[PDB]
Amino acid sequence: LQMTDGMHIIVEALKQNNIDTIYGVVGIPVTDMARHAQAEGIRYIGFRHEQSAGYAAAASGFLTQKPGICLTVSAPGFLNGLTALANATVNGFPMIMISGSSDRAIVDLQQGDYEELDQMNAAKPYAKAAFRVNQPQDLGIALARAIRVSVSGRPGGVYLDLPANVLAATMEKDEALTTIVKVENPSPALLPCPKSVTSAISLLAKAERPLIILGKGAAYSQADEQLREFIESAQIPFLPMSMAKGILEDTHPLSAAAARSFALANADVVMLVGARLNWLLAHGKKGWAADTQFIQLDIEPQEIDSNRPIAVPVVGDIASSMQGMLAELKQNTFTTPLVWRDILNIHKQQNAQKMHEKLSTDTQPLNYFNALSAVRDVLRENQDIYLVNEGANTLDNARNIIDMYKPRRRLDCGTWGVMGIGMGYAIGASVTSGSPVVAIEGDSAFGFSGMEIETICRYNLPVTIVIFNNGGIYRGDGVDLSGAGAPSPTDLLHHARYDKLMDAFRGVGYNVTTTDELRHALTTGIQSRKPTIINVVIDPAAGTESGHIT
Amino acid sequence: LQMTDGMHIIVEALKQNNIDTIYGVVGIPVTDMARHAQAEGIRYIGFRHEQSAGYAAAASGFLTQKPGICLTVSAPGFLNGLTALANATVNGFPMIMISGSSDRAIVDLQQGDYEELDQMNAAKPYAKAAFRVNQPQDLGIALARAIRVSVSGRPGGVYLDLPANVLAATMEKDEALTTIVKVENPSPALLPCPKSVTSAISLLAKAERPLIILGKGAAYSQADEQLREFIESAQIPFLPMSMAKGILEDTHPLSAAAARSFALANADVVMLVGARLNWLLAHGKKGWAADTQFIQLDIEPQEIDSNRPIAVPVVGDIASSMQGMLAELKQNTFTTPLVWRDILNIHKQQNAQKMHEKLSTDTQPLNYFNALSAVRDVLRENQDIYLVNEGANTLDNARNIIDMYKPRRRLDCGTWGVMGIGMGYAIGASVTSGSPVVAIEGDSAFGFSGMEIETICRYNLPVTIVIFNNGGIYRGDGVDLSGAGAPSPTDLLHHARYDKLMDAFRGVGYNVTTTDELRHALTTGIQSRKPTIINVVIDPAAGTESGHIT
Amino acid sequence: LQMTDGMHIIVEALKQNNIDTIYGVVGIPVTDMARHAQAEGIRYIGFRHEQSAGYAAAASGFLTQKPGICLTVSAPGFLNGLTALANATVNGFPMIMISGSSDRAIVDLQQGDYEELDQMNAAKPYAKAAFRVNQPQDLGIALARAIRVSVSGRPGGVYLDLPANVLAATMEKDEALTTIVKVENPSPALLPCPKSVTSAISLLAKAERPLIILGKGAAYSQADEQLREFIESAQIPFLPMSMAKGILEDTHPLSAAAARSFALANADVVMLVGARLNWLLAHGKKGWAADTQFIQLDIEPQEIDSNRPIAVPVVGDIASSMQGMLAELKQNTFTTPLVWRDILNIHKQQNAQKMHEKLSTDTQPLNYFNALSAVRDVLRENQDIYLVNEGANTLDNARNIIDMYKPRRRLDCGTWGVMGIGMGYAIGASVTSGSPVVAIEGDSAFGFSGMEIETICRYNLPVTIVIFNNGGIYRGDGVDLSGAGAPSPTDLLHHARYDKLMDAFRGVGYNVTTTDELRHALTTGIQSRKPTIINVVIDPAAGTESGHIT
């Protein structure tokens, strides 16, 4: 009569649900679980800090619509992972953080257990759901719930708490197998009200100056061909949000990106496709026409009327909504006013010329424009890469200058503006895709996850880390206002050589000061498939400090 | 008519309350505050991640009884800092995390503000109190509350939330000055019931086998001379918990450390001095006599009877309680039974011999014992250092082998067993004391805060980081059980050279493989006062993996 | 071999800790527990709603310094009791609410258990501590914790969660008895810093116009004789807060009550004794001298400097602090300036004149002043009674007009101004004391707990309920501003006859429209010891509506 235990049950449940990879940091009580998951054919990726493990899991979820799995220990590891779970929920990336926890009886009495925390309740504010499994026979259904919650509705983070006792708990093997649940279609199609689709098309056809905004929800939906067909059929100018860049190529003739300010100031009907009217769009206030009318395709009815009143909500999943939108358009065709497309193109050209001037003017030291022009030179020739990006000036300029050619290839600071997502997102992207990654990193930003370069080396991952070294936060020319000569609050070490970090882990380093050197280093980085750091010397005075001037 | 603003008011309040140092990471909306604090003479220490900034603040609080100040931005930075605030509260270290927050109106409506989070409510589970200041005239009293809460009762973390609007808000300068509060004596003496003191002494005098346990609460109290006088007067064997090592020197004749298991198994009366009967003491169950009677000196009445029933609670602050305990002993002297001290010494000697054998037997590669014997050789000659320590085997063995000679010189993983406190604790210790720090780090442990080596270099801090490189978590000889040849979940990169990391920041690196090399490198590290990493090659099979074997 | 179960263990634990009474409402899973507690000689008082059970428990706690026990079922009953637990914690009244809960496994997975709620975490925001007991061997220590937490520091509510499984769980009886914990002295003396006592006396001695404010913390402490001795020795004018009335008699020559506004506006040094500078004292702002200097005796260091900076904090328990204050006064005697006392008396005289004027003037219908004068006449001659009071006009006028002669006899809406405490407070006071109770109730206030008149009848409790029936909330002469003739939002039924409710339960009812009728009815009610309602017809226009006038 064969027995098994909780730890074996949960691994089998993960296996049956097509989990291929776990991202984590081990320790009591989950080391055996990780070892056994790896024994059973799941790829285990161990990190230097759980935050990056959680970011990697979230990245994998965004890219695939299958929740990323993050594994942590109890309280101290759990809390580190929770910061990443929170970010997944805020951005809408599906993942499950699985954490060991301690003795329920001791923790419930606050007696000072090993790594004591009510982790389930701790996670609740930051997750779509937090579940805790006390009986090994409930592990299968618990994971089924976790999967469904993570990927349904607006996707997000779920916390799954496994007390040490449940991992050790035994039951008969044959019986245990009957309790494992393989979830089919955890996020089924949800189709919008046909009347709302009809109203959406009717309003677009009446519009003098329509604009589509594609958010990362649009990207996530993978409805790439349908979105392109709709945009091209009615010739509707579109604006891609950061992680929606590439659904249509950034150089597409209908992209209004190069005239973003004008487009938002003047559009009379704006169709939001999986994009929130949050701070990233100034809440539809500053910079917008006074009486913009909105159509909004979103799966989350709670998002409607959060900021500006929405004239035409289209509630349902974007793929399904676009099916209806396309069928309605076919029956009631329209063409966006030529004069609107023309005026957009006039503004786009003026701005493109101003940009070109900056990109093409060499300086010493390098600035953000000529440095990113060099990067763009290389990426234009290496279009099958993933791009991770974080920083302040490093982020905003790379977003503007680096064109995406394919969808779901750009991963950045996102909705909460998190510095520290770089290495995790690179590891998750690389593991998930098998493709090279280029991480364009601010020097401050890099410092939040920089130890994970050892993880990149340990797994021989094709990540090239390009650090825009301006010697600090926003700028590197700060002064201690007391006169004491200390580093200012935004200064980092003068002329640090981040490339040299790779020596410790047998990776590759390049120091670059010119566009020619940068082009050569980055080309070699990508083609070599070797873990590489490129230290780029950037004018300490080139950047701008974000925020209000008093 | 001169005006000022919230940001100026809070800095002046910090100044008036003798805050000398702020540990933080800047960005919107706190960059100006940090710049101005530095202008006004406060030392600003900027980190690569807020977690280490928070750990540094907590360390400074433990060492001084003045709350450490940690400064962060809104949501993403706040959450990183919160993990450290939680650790301060769990350990009982006084600190205040001051964080910027966003627009109260937008956040209260969940409209998707920049870095949106109800941070005040987020912090509540992890802090003694979380306050939020909406009016600049309330900044003075808010800081007064924060100071009092952080250092009174059981000390801990307090969260102080400063919305961007309060920092910008103006008022008349003369009026503003009248609203600033300088707190005198925020943690006043609290004396125990005299009858409890009488009962405590009476029970000790009746005891056949009394034992004092000194916890880090005892250390924190700074009642070093009183504790020594009491212990020496009645000749009571004592056991120092980890961060209480050194209150009396570890080689003191009455230290029962070398017979810890015997002492706990046999003592009939145990006097807990600022030490919880939590997991670190097996909750007074496994390894303890069946009917141990307890005396407990603690400031927190809620701690009494958490685990074992306490026969004699002595509730009050330890310095005050020891005043009464000493006065009562003087009036009613006793001597601990000689036969108890003798049997303790018999066990201590046997264990010391077993230890000596391990310490003195050279091996190749080095193991934990001979490597820490080399460290002990050096530290015996450099007794005016601070010791930071984290890891699993690296922690337990260094705790056992490295003697402390002075109080409040040892900082480690603490109550929650956190990996990642090393660099923050080193920075906080170094800045607070002006003394050299030796950080004895596991290689996994180091990876949780390793980027802060740049911070150490930026401020030219005398920190020597000694990394016990066994190539992974607990051990470095793991195998992928699938047969695929991947790194196992506990393996780190084979033969990483952490010393080489310092090259990037113009620090010093040593690689060591023998005790002679280790002695030389560590001696040079300390004496040079230069930021140094020592990479110690440790037998990958020397350590033990913690946890239960199934 | 004799077995027992968790239900028997917790009952024995309550019995050993001198719990004499449980206030509750039963149902699954606690009915058997109540039956058995009652079998074992604990008095069981069953209510019509858990909120009143919780208020009764809190009142018992305030009167005795022994935590009142409230027993409820799972989710629905728990949540009702929680509202009362919250109120106890806000007011600082010691109590333990013990609730059954459902199946931890099902609730942790949110699968829709019977009465599903994580009650332990639900309670945390409203309680000093929330504990949940999973193993029957831990019941004794859990109760010990709950007791100690509830009465130590600032007393408050504690939540104790008993899953149905722990109640049914068995263990050996002999072993179970060894796990029961009898708590001795759960709130021991905590003595103030001697320097703070010296400073307090020195400041009072220098004061031209000193004033003591006695709060309900002072009443709770039971230091009646010490407080009186101090006040009378130095001849310090005092102001009692509502539930501190009667520590010294309200007609005491040194009471500044009749000149409260004058006293607060003109005192130069104010000594708060167990009283917060919260809204009840206008936060030390409106109506206070501009630069009042405060002395504050409080057990809670976190309370110091919450509102106005406190010149002399005296942190410790009031009984201990007053021992010190008296000793220090005896060595350094003083009396307050006679001029200050004489001038206070001038102002009291003026206000008492105007008060007794209104009190003595008949009207038809009755108003608050002449009605409460009649009440005052009777209560003067029955100084053994407890006074419960709630309403708006009914509360404020009764507080001013009805003098208390003995301490801890007045129970009211308290710090959160709760309507709905009346019946519960009356039942708790009557059961605790064995004395008659008079509840002076607004008609709206009464409606919040009125069904508990059946409970009063069921237990034949000597409660006389005097309802000030003005036909509404504040006033009874509101008008529907639409012109439709509906009751206004503040109107209750015209000429309701609440005395008739007693007929349902075989109680006594009186309807009164004159002061002579009221005198007779109230005298008869108290003397008869029978449950009685007196419906007092009050002029609908007599009251004032509280709040800001636009």
Ligand SMILES: Nc1ncnc2c1ncn2[C@@H]1O[C@H](COP(=O)(O)OP(=O)(O)O)[C@@H](O)[C@H]1O
């Ligand atoms: N498959 C889907 N169908 C419809 N809406 C989706 C889908 N996936 C995500 N969403 C919605 O997409 C939106 C993403 O918005 P946001 O994260 O603000 O994007 P951006 O930052 O690119 O503007 C969310 O409101 C979310 O509910």
Ligand SMILES: Nc1ncnc2c1ncn2[C@@H]1O[C@H](COP(=O)(O)OP(=O)(O)O)[C@@H](O)[C@H]1O
């Ligand atoms: N000055 C003080 N006086 C009395 N008790 C204190 C003081 N400072 C801290 N404490 C108490 O000291 C205890 C520290 O215990 P703990 O952190 O468990 O130490 P350890 O890990 O060394 O056993 C806490 O229970 C805390 O309330």
Ligand SMILES: Nc1ncnc2c1ncn2[C@@H]1O[C@H](COP(=O)(O)OP(=O)(O)O)[C@@H](O)[C@H]1O
């Ligand atoms: N035994 C005691 N010794 C000292 N302070 C106490 C004691 N019991 C309660 N307190 C304190 O008494 C205060 C009561 O204040 P509060 O409820 O505002 O009274 P009031 O409403 O009468 O002004 C609280 O601050 C509490 O901490």
Ligand SMILES: Cc1ncc(C[n+]2csc(CCOP(=O)(O)OP(=O)(O)O)c2C)c(N)n1
């Ligand atoms: C976790 C976290 N901490 C702090 C911030 C505040 N912050 C915004 S940008 C930034 C870094 C900007 O400097 P860098 O990455 O070097 O980019 P640069 O502008 O210099 O190119 C920081 C720390 C944040 N967004 N997230």
Ligand SMILES: Cc1ncc(C[n+]2csc(CCOP(=O)(O)OP(=O)(O)O)c2C)c(N)n1
């Ligand atoms: C934040 C956090 N994550 C994970 C753990 C689990 N954990 C316990 S010890 C340990 C590291 C042990 O390895 P190392 O520091 O290299 O010490 P060694 O035993 O190898 O000397 C970890 C990751 C923890 N305590 N804290």
Ligand SMILES: Cc1ncc(C[n+]2csc(CCOP(=O)(O)OP(=O)(O)O)c2C)c(N)n1
């Ligand atoms: C639980 C609760 N709900 C509502 C209120 C608001 N409130 C203040 S006074 C009051 C009743 C006032 O009317 P009444 O009790 O009849 O006294 P009157 O002034 O008419 O004498 C109410 C409902 C409250 N304090 N508590």
Ligand SMILES: [Mg+2]
């Ligand atoms: Mg930078």
Ligand SMILES: [Mg+2]
């Ligand atoms: Mg190691």
Ligand SMILES: [Mg+2]
């Ligand atoms: Mg009324």
